[PDB]
Amino acid sequence: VTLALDKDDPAKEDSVKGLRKDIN
Amino acid sequence: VNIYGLTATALFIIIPTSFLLILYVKTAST
Amino acid sequence: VNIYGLTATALFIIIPTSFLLILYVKTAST
Amino acid sequence: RPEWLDGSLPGDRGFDPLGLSKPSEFVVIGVDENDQNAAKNNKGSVEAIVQAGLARFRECELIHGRWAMLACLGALVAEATTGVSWVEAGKVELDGASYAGLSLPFSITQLIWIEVILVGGAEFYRNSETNPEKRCYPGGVFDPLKLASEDEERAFRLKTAEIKHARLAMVSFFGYGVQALST
Amino acid sequence: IFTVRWLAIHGIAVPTIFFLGAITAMQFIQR
Amino acid sequence: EPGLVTPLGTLLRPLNSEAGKVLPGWGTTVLMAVFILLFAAFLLIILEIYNSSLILDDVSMSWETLAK
Amino acid sequence: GAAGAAAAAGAAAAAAAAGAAAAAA
Amino acid sequence: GLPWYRVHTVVINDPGRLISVHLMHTALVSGWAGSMALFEISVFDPSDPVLNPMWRQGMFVLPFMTRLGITQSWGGWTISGETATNPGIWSYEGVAAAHIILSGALFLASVWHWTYWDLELFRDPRTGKTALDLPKIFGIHLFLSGLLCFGFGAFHVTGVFGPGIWVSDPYGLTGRVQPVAPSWGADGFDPYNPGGIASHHIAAGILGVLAGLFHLCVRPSIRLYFGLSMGSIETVLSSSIAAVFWAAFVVAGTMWYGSAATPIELFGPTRYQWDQGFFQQEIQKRVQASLAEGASLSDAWSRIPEKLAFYDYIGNNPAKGGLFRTGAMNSGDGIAVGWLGHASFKDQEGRELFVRRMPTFFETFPVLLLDKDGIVRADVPFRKAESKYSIEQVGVSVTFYGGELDGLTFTDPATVKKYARKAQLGEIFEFDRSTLQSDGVFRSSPRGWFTFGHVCFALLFFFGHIWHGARTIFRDVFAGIDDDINDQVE
Amino acid sequence: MEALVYTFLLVGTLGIIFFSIFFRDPPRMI
Amino acid sequence: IGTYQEKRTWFDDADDWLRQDRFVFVGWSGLLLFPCAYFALGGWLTGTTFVTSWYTHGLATSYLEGCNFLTAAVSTPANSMAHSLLFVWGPEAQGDFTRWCQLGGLWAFVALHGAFGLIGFMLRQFEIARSVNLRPYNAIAFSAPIAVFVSVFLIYPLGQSGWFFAPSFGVAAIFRFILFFQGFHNWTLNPFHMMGVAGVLGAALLCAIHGATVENTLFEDGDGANTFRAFNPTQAEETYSMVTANRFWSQIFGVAFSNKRWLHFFMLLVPVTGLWMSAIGVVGLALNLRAYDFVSQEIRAAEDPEFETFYTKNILLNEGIRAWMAAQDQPHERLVFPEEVLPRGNAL
Amino acid sequence: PNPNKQVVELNRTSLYWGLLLIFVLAVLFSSYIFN
Amino acid sequence: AVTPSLKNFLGSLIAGATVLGGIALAITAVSKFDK
Amino acid sequence: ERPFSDILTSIRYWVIHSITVPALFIAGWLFVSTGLAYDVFGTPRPNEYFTEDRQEAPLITDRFNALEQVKKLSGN
Ligand code: CLA
Ligand code: CLA
Ligand code: CLA
Ligand code: CLA
Ligand SMILES: CCCCCCCCCCCCCCCC(=O)OC[C@H](CO[C@@H]1O[C@H](CS(=O)(=O)O)[C@@H](O)[C@H](O)[C@H]1O)OC(=O)CCCCCCCCCCCCCCC
Ligand SMILES: CC1=C(/C=C/C(C)=C/C=C/C(C)=C/C=C/C=C(C)/C=C/C=C(C)/C=C/C2=C(C)CCCC2(C)C)C(C)(C)CCC1
Ligand SMILES: CC1=C(\C=C/C(C)=C/C=C/C(C)=C/C=C/C=C(C)/C=C/C=C(C)/C=C/C2=C(C)CCCC2(C)C)C(C)(C)CCC1
């Protein structure tokens, strides 16, 4: 349903998962 | 109203108040 | 452990301690 | 080539890339005034130029190399006879004390007390001498075969024999230090 | 003349007139 | 007026002996400046690893270093 | 553009002429 | 006579009273260390190391004893959560006593050096006045420094003879004192590697010995004697105060950013772990490790340690505090008792919802419930007169997984708003505001308090470097300038 | 309770103002 | 030289050229000041004129964009650069100058060369005071602008989530950093800023009083109505009656200076003690150790719905600053607030 | 017989600055200490 | 191996020497022949 | 020698600074009016703030990959 990336995007959005590799 | 702040106020008065009174009455008698 | 006795002990020390220190350091410099 | 060497010495060569044994001049600065009761305190002045330890440096190579010659000759044969690495001694001697396979009765705590009394007091007696040729080369019981009757101040080199073997034994134990942890 | 007093003023004055020509042309950039 | 002589005071006496004595000229100052600039270069190594400004492939530079 | 350089080169040659109009005097 | 701010300069001229006056300061510092360690042991609650650890209780110097191996006590308890069968002599109370016994020994030594100030050691030969050979004195103390540095690194940290330091996992769950091996590659400069600490103190200890042997033998240059004013005992003070604020910025910097020398099981998490979603990502990494292998929700959220969910909480963030919000972190929100579950939010269209967490800046923050793709779907509105994102109309229910409320659902629009405002603070926990009579607003960890002192000290010691460097270079004009000094104009 | 402490600190500050004016160390000329 | 007469090396040939009494003094510090201070001023005047902030901040900050002197700035990097030093050879910029400007790296160009410029200027006035053989009090006073600069521009963002929350170098850009600290830190309430106000606003009083007390107790040393002509700086006597000045304020204000040396040191002391205390408060705000709340008045105002003070009014105004700017002040958060969730009074 | 013996002096104007300083800091900070 | 971040960093310490040397070279050129 | 008032009143100062000073003003005029200032510093022109991909403010949001991302945010 939800990836761990787009669960930490709507909750924190400063996340080290969400910030790196964000050229896509 | 805490035990800290009521006696921290009294120690910050009297320990530097009397220290300055020790040095003044020393000096004013010279 | 009351608010009275913990600071009544500290005032009965420091107010006569420093009073005697005011008179001694006055005297020991003369 | 250096000029402050090459005479009355076994290793008569100017190897020094930097001149560690160079006798340098000295100038003595006066002590700065720190009295508060003066109005001005000055930063001191040049007072005394002084004209000016090769004797001290000769003693200190000789001690290091002779400990190295006891170390290099002692690590090859304890690896040969016993069959344990020279780094492993201490790990296997805390468990069981031995010498050439023969069990010894001493706790490891006693070895601290034995070594600081025996080796320590002998080190306290070596620096109890005030003659730098006697400090480098003593007499007495340490010369049972009488080297001291034989001269070396001329081209005779009867003293220049431990000093080369002291040098590479420090190096071969330095080669043991680059081999122990790394390889 | 290349002295210290010459390099002090013309370190300041030469880019100042360069940017004052730049900022003046920005007043006439409409969009 | 001589000072107070003590057994530890004379054991330590030649350590407080040559006060005020210096080499003439510059001595090892140029040797010092090589060691200052290497340590200035060394402090720029560890400043940028910890800032992730110089990146080494061997380091992790994270709390994930505690794993491996 | 061009007119920002045309009136610029005009006073580049006018102040060169007016700077020489008092330099000849 | 002297002013009040100049009284301690009676010691600048005689070295014997300088021993005696540093001995009294050293007796007071270790006298504080034992007295603070006795105070912290007398108030420490070792019952729950998982959910009420030492950084949660306001312990400041107890994570410094525990950092270098002291894990056991004379009350039976340990830090890892077991009984000490042999506490030894180096307990917490043994070290708290070893600093007080040292405090009285340094006290008596200071009384000795105050009376016997006029030692012959302090007078140099053939001038007879009090003098100190500060280049060699530095060479002695740098030699002892690198000897202790190499001793601490090769023996204490490496575990060759000493116990070792604290090493934990990346996520603060499994942490002990165990020996480390030195790491001599590029990996030793990663400051989250504990092996670089042992590899530091060996390499810096050996070089500090070799540098100490230099400054014992090689006298300084004359041009560098005057230019650094080596003949004064204050040019070593200015350069040492310069050394200790440099150190205090590094020390408070690595405390705030986190390092291998600052574990989070001792000092708490950092503010950059809440901001960058450090524990939240791992909590999601372990749920998705279980939902992919085949498991339920409530059986996957039960497999997460209750200690890991406690790091993922805004109240343990060190930057959610106040300057005069004094005391333990337990005095703010309460003592944590149990993890209350994982609040999962769904609306009436069967869509999951995710509470936008409170950022570290915000004292208050509006509660927002975002979807998978990051679009706000529900909130607790401020104006409720004509709303279009209210929880009441969107129909937000909340279900928990794991914890004390496992398998329990709440659809009441008053109840859901209560747990939505707790879910922006992190994982949901149950506290008690009656054990310590908690205020209700958070505090900062010892990681934040240590950093506050050691940047305020590092900044005030910048000024003391400026003052004491100026009093050496301008020593001759301290009492005023000369009368004919008008030659400095044209 | 704390308002008693607040007024004592305000009365004490106004006391020093009274002594600093009417019992100041008088500037001696020459 | 050195009263032992060695031969001059190339240092002495460099020391006397630097320490030359020319028009502008260079000195040894000028090898640090004049390259760094020219690039802080040159970086600021270039960044306010040409360099955008459309990528780091999502907002225009240069004259070429349309901004004027008040709204143009050299803006901070994005929160995605964390505390990156943003070297132009760095891992973010990687040599390209036109992207280094777009990545806000020209902020850290100004901030670092400005920081080593302040070291170069403070060493300048140790170096001149040792040439002139004065006392070093001009440098010790400049520790307080360095205490302010380091604690705000360097120490504060290192404790926060990045260089983003630094002040940008502008006029309106400082003004939001000021309004950021009210809304988020309640920085008026912090007692270190209160000692910072009383130092700054008390040195302005001492500047205006000592200027006016001197200028109105002058001795009649000339004939004309211009009193500025009746002075020669090589005169040995005071130019104004200190005794009249003392008797004036001892009867107006009740307390006056009688010591001229204590007066001018007190003028030295008040702005320096004021800025060093306020620098400690910004060090406290780097860790968000705020003096935000009086908890005894929050417990009362939550248990009593009619207890209103000017304090609780200030707490409500900070909630207004926080929610209404942070959708645009912090674009890295990517928080969208629907208009019904922001706080709002009646009919505004 | 230490030659480094000095005396501290404190005139009444410095008494009045010192007593004022520790009461004004107590006026300032105790509002935060009592919280 | 060597990363490009280390290549640009070591290139900066070369460029930091050609800057700091050339500032030092300019003050030992004016010191000698006075231009 | 030359104390700042025999320079400004000298005519040889103004036979220099009535030629180099206007040609430097024009050099600053043409640095921006030829659009070169938009290229050197990377500031966007008033028709370059919003491409067709985005109609919002840019957001860098990535540390080590920002160099090629700002090329994609600008639209190049
Ligand atoms: C040898 C005796 C001894 C021993 C074994 C200990 C042991 C301990 N002390 Mg105690 N202490 C002692 C003496 C001792 N102390 C004395 C004499 C004092 C008074 C000064 C204190 C004051 C003291 C305090 C105030 C505290 C301790 C604490 C501690 C504990 C942790 C130490 C720690 O983390 O420090 C960390 C140490 C360092 C980071 C060292 C800093 C040195 C810097 C990095 C070196 C820089 C200068 C150097 C010369 C540079 C050159 C290097 C190279 C080139 C040579 C530990 C149980 C802590 C604790 O938990 O106690 C309750 C604590 O808070 N101690
Ligand atoms: C191969 C051997 C080896 C190894 C693996 C290490 C490993 C390490 N060393 Mg050691 N070191 C060694 C040999 C070694 N060292 C030797 C031979 C020396 C010479 C004696 C040193 C001297 C040394 C020093 C002096 C320091 C280290 C530090 C470190 C750590 C670097 C990572 C870190 O914590 O960064 C963190 C440190 C930094 C990023 C340093 C940057 C310094 C900044 C610029 C200071 C800022 C203050 C300044 C006044 C700026 C103004 C304030 C600002 C807010 C504006 C790490 C443990 C550092 C350390 O212990 O950190 C905890 C440290 O400070 N080492
Ligand atoms: C660098 C030093 C340092 C650091 C970081 C800490 C850190 C800590 N201590 Mg420890 N402590 C220290 C030194 C230190 N301590 C010393 C030297 C003592 C001996 C007096 C103590 C005695 C001590 C006790 C007895 C307790 C703590 C506690 C605490 C914790 C709560 C912090 C707190 O409430 O701050 C409070 C911070 C402030 C109020 C801000 C200070 C700002 C300035 C200094 C105010 C001064 C202004 C003004 C002039 C004062 C006049 C006002 C007047 C009315 C008094 C924290 C872990 C508590 C704890 O949690 O223990 C479990 C606790 O009960 N500490
Ligand atoms: C290693 C640190 C260190 C050392 C040894 C000294 C030593 C000295 N300083 Mg320096 N100084 C330092 C740091 C240091 N200072 C710092 C950090 C600053 C910036 C604030 C200064 C600013 C400074 C000035 C401005 C002056 C000195 C002066 C002096 C001399 C006399 C001090 C005196 O009589 O105080 C007497 C102090 C008192 C009677 C009471 C002070 C009480 C305050 C409020 C502190 C409270 C004590 C507290 C419990 C301890 C906590 C301290 C903390 C660091 C742990 C002496 C040589 C004086 C000097 O050079 O004389 C010519 C002088 O004028 N110092
Ligand atoms: C009620 C007000 C509000 C309360 C404020 C509480 C805090 C007060 C803080 C300030 C305390 C005083 C600071 C030091 C003053 C000083 O040194 O003066 C110096 C002068 C010396 O002047 C000389 O005194 C000589 C007499 S003698 O030398 O002192 O014997 C005299 O002959 C000569 O003319 C004269 O020049 O002292 C005097 O003139 C009289 C002695 C003052 C005694 C101290 C008073 C203490 C306060 C008690 C007030 C009641 C408190 C309880 C009720 C609330
Ligand atoms: C004689 C003797 C003895 C005893 C000893 C003892 C008992 C000791 C103690 C000691 C002690 C008991 C000490 C203590 C100390 C303390 C201290 C020293 C403290 C200090 C404090 C401070 C310093 C503070 C500061 C501050 C403030 C003011 C506030 C806040 C901030 C700060 C932190 C800055 C015995 C019997 C054993 C035997 C031997 C001999
Ligand atoms: C950045 C950078 C760089 C480059 C360059 C530079 C450095 C430049 C500089 C520049 C500069 C240095 C500039 C300047 C400018 C100035 C200006 C722009 C000014 C203006 C002014 C004005 C505008 C004024 C007006 C007025 C007033 C207000 C007063 C008087 C009158 C009048 C009206 C006129 C480098 C390479 C290094 C590196 C990278 C970065």
PDB file of N, CA, C and O in Angstrom, chain H residues 222-246:
ATOM      1  N   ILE H 222      65.224  32.646  19.944  1.00  0.00           N
ATOM      2  CA  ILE H 222      65.179  33.926  20.639  1.00  0.00           C
ATOM      3  C   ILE H 222      64.135  34.842  20.009  1.00  0.00           C
ATOM      4  O   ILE H 222      63.436  35.579  20.712  1.00  0.00           O
ATOM      5  N   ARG H 223      63.973  34.771  18.685  1.00  0.00           N
ATOM      6  CA  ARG H 223      62.999  35.611  18.005  1.00  0.00           C
ATOM      7  C   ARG H 223      61.584  35.169  18.330  1.00  0.00           C
ATOM      8  O   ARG H 223      60.668  35.993  18.418  1.00  0.00           O
ATOM      9  N   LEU H 224      61.408  33.884  18.570  1.00  0.00           N
ATOM     10  CA  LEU H 224      60.149  33.314  18.997  1.00  0.00           C
ATOM     11  C   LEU H 224      60.023  33.266  20.516  1.00  0.00           C
ATOM     12  O   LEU H 224      58.959  32.914  21.027  1.00  0.00           O
ATOM     13  N   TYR H 225      61.074  33.647  21.246  1.00  0.00           N
ATOM     14  CA  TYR H 225      60.951  33.859  22.686  1.00  0.00           C
ATOM     15  C   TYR H 225      60.267  35.187  22.973  1.00  0.00           C
ATOM     16  O   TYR H 225      59.378  35.269  23.825  1.00  0.00           O
ATOM     17  N   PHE H 226      60.688  36.246  22.280  1.00  0.00           N
ATOM     18  CA  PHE H 226      60.117  37.563  22.526  1.00  0.00           C
ATOM     19  C   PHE H 226      58.761  37.720  21.859  1.00  0.00           C
ATOM     20  O   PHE H 226      57.867  38.364  22.415  1.00  0.00           O
ATOM     21  N   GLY H 227      58.595  37.150  20.664  1.00  0.00           N
ATOM     22  CA  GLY H 227      57.368  37.344  19.916  1.00  0.00           C
ATOM     23  C   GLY H 227      56.168  36.659  20.534  1.00  0.00           C
ATOM     24  O   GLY H 227      55.031  37.087  20.322  1.00  0.00           O
ATOM     25  N   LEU H 228      56.397  35.603  21.305  1.00  0.00           N
ATOM     26  CA  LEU H 228      55.337  34.952  22.055  1.00  0.00           C
ATOM     27  C   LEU H 228      55.459  35.178  23.550  1.00  0.00           C
ATOM     28  O   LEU H 228      54.681  34.591  24.306  1.00  0.00           O
ATOM     29  N   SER H 229      56.428  35.993  23.980  1.00  0.00           N
ATOM     30  CA  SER H 229      56.564  36.486  25.354  1.00  0.00           C
ATOM     31  C   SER H 229      56.740  35.354  26.358  1.00  0.00           C
ATOM     32  O   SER H 229      56.222  35.423  27.472  1.00  0.00           O
ATOM     33  N   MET H 230      57.536  34.345  25.968  1.00  0.00           N
ATOM     34  CA  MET H 230      57.723  33.083  26.691  1.00  0.00           C
ATOM     35  C   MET H 230      58.125  33.243  28.149  1.00  0.00           C
ATOM     36  O   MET H 230      57.899  32.327  28.945  1.00  0.00           O
ATOM     37  N   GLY H 231      58.751  34.355  28.513  1.00  0.00           N
ATOM     38  CA  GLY H 231      59.182  34.564  29.875  1.00  0.00           C
ATOM     39  C   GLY H 231      58.095  34.958  30.843  1.00  0.00           C
ATOM     40  O   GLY H 231      58.397  35.217  32.010  1.00  0.00           O
ATOM     41  N   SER H 232      56.845  35.017  30.400  1.00  0.00           N
ATOM     42  CA  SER H 232      55.725  35.337  31.265  1.00  0.00           C
ATOM     43  C   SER H 232      54.862  34.107  31.489  1.00  0.00           C
ATOM     44  O   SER H 232      54.602  33.329  30.570  1.00  0.00           O
ATOM     45  N   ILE H 233      54.380  33.968  32.728  1.00  0.00           N
ATOM     46  CA  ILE H 233      53.423  32.928  33.085  1.00  0.00           C
ATOM     47  C   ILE H 233      52.017  33.255  32.587  1.00  0.00           C
ATOM     48  O   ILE H 233      51.093  32.451  32.759  1.00  0.00           O
ATOM     49  N   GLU H 234      51.817  34.405  31.954  1.00  0.00           N
ATOM     50  CA  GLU H 234      50.509  34.701  31.403  1.00  0.00           C
ATOM     51  C   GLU H 234      50.419  34.416  29.907  1.00  0.00           C
ATOM     52  O   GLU H 234      49.309  34.261  29.389  1.00  0.00           O
ATOM     53  N   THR H 235      51.544  34.296  29.196  1.00  0.00           N
ATOM     54  CA  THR H 235      51.449  33.921  27.790  1.00  0.00           C
ATOM     55  C   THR H 235      51.170  32.440  27.628  1.00  0.00           C
ATOM     56  O   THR H 235      50.779  32.004  26.542  1.00  0.00           O
ATOM     57  N   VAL H 236      51.371  31.662  28.680  1.00  0.00           N
ATOM     58  CA  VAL H 236      50.913  30.291  28.701  1.00  0.00           C
ATOM     59  C   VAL H 236      49.451  30.225  29.130  1.00  0.00           C
ATOM     60  O   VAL H 236      48.707  29.373  28.638  1.00  0.00           O
ATOM     61  N   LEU H 237      48.990  31.186  29.935  1.00  0.00           N
ATOM     62  CA  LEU H 237      47.573  31.243  30.286  1.00  0.00           C
ATOM     63  C   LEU H 237      46.707  31.609  29.091  1.00  0.00           C
ATOM     64  O   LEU H 237      45.669  30.983  28.867  1.00  0.00           O
ATOM     65  N   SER H 238      47.118  32.611  28.315  1.00  0.00           N
ATOM     66  CA  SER H 238      46.360  33.017  27.138  1.00  0.00           C
ATOM     67  C   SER H 238      46.291  31.920  26.089  1.00  0.00           C
ATOM     68  O   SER H 238      45.248  31.714  25.465  1.00  0.00           O
ATOM     69  N   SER H 239      47.396  31.223  25.868  1.00  0.00           N
ATOM     70  CA  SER H 239      47.407  30.136  24.910  1.00  0.00           C
ATOM     71  C   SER H 239      46.694  28.899  25.429  1.00  0.00           C
ATOM     72  O   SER H 239      46.209  28.102  24.623  1.00  0.00           O
ATOM     73  N   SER H 240      46.607  28.724  26.750  1.00  0.00           N
ATOM     74  CA  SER H 240      45.865  27.589  27.285  1.00  0.00           C
ATOM     75  C   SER H 240      44.372  27.851  27.280  1.00  0.00           C
ATOM     76  O   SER H 240      43.582  26.928  27.061  1.00  0.00           O
ATOM     77  N   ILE H 241      43.962  29.088  27.563  1.00  0.00           N
ATOM     78  CA  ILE H 241      42.556  29.453  27.439  1.00  0.00           C
ATOM     79  C   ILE H 241      42.125  29.367  25.983  1.00  0.00           C
ATOM     80  O   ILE H 241      41.002  28.954  25.674  1.00  0.00           O
ATOM     81  N   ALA H 242      43.035  29.691  25.065  1.00  0.00           N
ATOM     82  CA  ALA H 242      42.789  29.446  23.653  1.00  0.00           C
ATOM     83  C   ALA H 242      42.679  27.962  23.349  1.00  0.00           C
ATOM     84  O   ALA H 242      41.920  27.569  22.458  1.00  0.00           O
ATOM     85  N   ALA H 243      43.414  27.126  24.075  1.00  0.00           N
ATOM     86  CA  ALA H 243      43.324  25.692  23.851  1.00  0.00           C
ATOM     87  C   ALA H 243      42.018  25.122  24.373  1.00  0.00           C
ATOM     88  O   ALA H 243      41.474  24.187  23.779  1.00  0.00           O
ATOM     89  N   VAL H 244      41.481  25.673  25.465  1.00  0.00           N
ATOM     90  CA  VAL H 244      40.327  25.053  26.099  1.00  0.00           C
ATOM     91  C   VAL H 244      38.999  25.601  25.607  1.00  0.00           C
ATOM     92  O   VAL H 244      37.964  24.996  25.903  1.00  0.00           O
ATOM     93  N   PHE H 245      38.968  26.716  24.869  1.00  0.00           N
ATOM     94  CA  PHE H 245      37.697  26.994  24.213  1.00  0.00           C
ATOM     95  C   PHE H 245      37.607  26.329  22.854  1.00  0.00           C
ATOM     96  O   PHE H 245      36.501  25.993  22.428  1.00  0.00           O
ATOM     97  N   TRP H 246      38.739  26.187  22.156  1.00  0.00           N
ATOM     98  CA  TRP H 246      38.808  25.326  20.979  1.00  0.00           C
ATOM     99  C   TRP H 246      38.308  23.935  21.297  1.00  0.00           C
ATOM    100  O   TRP H 246      37.539  23.349  20.530  1.00  0.00           O
TER     101      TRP H 246
END
